[PDB]
Structures are given as C-alpha cells and as structure tokens.
Amino acid sequence: VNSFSGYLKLTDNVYIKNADIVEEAKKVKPTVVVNAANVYLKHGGGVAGALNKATNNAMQVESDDYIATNGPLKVGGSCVLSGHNLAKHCLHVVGPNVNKGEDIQLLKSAYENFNQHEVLLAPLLSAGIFGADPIHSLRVCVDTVRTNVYLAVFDKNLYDKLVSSFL
Ligand SMILES: O=C(N[C@H]1c2cccc(O)c2C[C@@H]1C(=O)O)c1ccc2[nH]c(CO)nc2c1
C-alpha cells in the first residue's frame, strides 16, 4: 500500500491521473519524482521548468554542479539527484526531443531507467514540448516499465484522450 490517490489503473503496474506533477509531488512526497530533463539539465520550461521553479531554483543549482563535474547526459540516459522539497530523489531522464530531431526509438531506452526504482511519480517522457505523441509514449511506457509508475498528466483533455484510446 502506498499514498498515491485517485489514479486510474491501466495495467498491473501503470497508473495514471490528471494532475499537476508539482502539486502531486508536494502532497505525496514520493521517493522518486521523474523530471523530463535535457542532456544539459537546463530546466527552462515544460515539466522541468515547473519542477525547478517549485524548488526555488535549487534543482538548477544542483544540476549545474552535476554537469560541471560529469558533463552532459546521453539522450536515453538519466541521473539521480536530490528531490529537494518535492521528493526524496529526482530521477532526471532524457527522452528524445523530436523538435531537435532525436531518434524516437531512444524513448524505450529512456523508460528503461524507471526500472531501477520500485515506485515513481512521473510525466510521460518526450511528451509536451519534447514533441512526441503522448499516446505512443504511453504505449512505450506500458511495454517497457515493469516497476510501479504513477503518471501525472497535466492536461485534462489529453488525460481523457490517453484513457479513451488506451489498448
Ligand atoms: O509541460 C508539462 N508537462 C508535459 C511535458 C513537458 C515536457 C516533456 C514531456 O515529456 C512532457 C509530458 C508532460 C505532460 O503531458 O503532463 C508541464 C507539467 C506541469 C506544469 N506545471 C506548470 C506550471 O505552470 N507548467 C507545467 C508544464
């Protein structure tokens, strides 16, 4: 038993809710919140900009030190950093950005990072400003992630569509 409330159960291990991931993290304090990161950990907009704003830019400060030490992530890769006031940990995961021409097949590799964590609050990778089809992203998520994933979908209209078209 865990504290996520109001989710619709899609599969054995995937749940989904129309929610603001920032508000969900602050209420739930999950062990892991997933950020829709880029390779530079520049949290300017979309989910990343919202999560970072909620941390009063502490996420960005920590991220800049990470990059200065380690260099950029790989597309499809991830790193674990602090969750600040939102979660114990933040798993920064880089899905391919279609608006940068990145290979969509890397989406499966990106979701594989979730399997290193028993339970996660997460957005749909490569959705929103990353330019992928959220329905495809949901399919890859369901077919790749084996751990328990609680997906927060900000847009109500999109949430309903994802549910209604789910196979
Ligand atoms: O853009 C946002 N989320 C979408 C996104 C973005 C980039 C890559 C992605 O893969 C996805 C998928 C994610 C989604 O479909 O839910 C977002 C989420 C919460 C927000 N809270 C505020 C306050 O103003 N702005 C927000 C923006």
Swiss-Prot record:
Changing residue 31 to A: In strain: Mu/B.1.621. Changing residue 164 to L: In strain: Gamma/P.1. May form homohexamers. Interacts with N protein. Residues 1-167 form the Macro domain. It is found in: Host endoplasmic reticulum membrane. This is Papain-like protease nsp3. Responsible for the cleavages located at the N-terminus of the replicase polyprotein. Participates together with nsp4 in the assembly of virally-induced cytoplasmic double-membrane vesicles necessary for viral replication. Antagonizes innate immune induction of type I interferon by blocking the phosphorylation, dimerization and subsequent nuclear translocation of host IRF3. Also prevents host NF-kappa-B signaling. In addition, PL-PRO possesses a deubiquitinating/deISGylating activity and processes both 'Lys-48'- and 'Lys-63'-linked polyubiquitin chains from cellular substrates. It catalyses: Thiol-dependent hydrolysis of ester, thioester, amide, peptide and isopeptide bonds formed by the C-terminal Gly of ubiquitin (a 76-residue protein attached to proteins as an intracellular targeting signal). It is a multi-pass membrane protein. The gene is rep. Inhibited in vitro by GRL-0617.
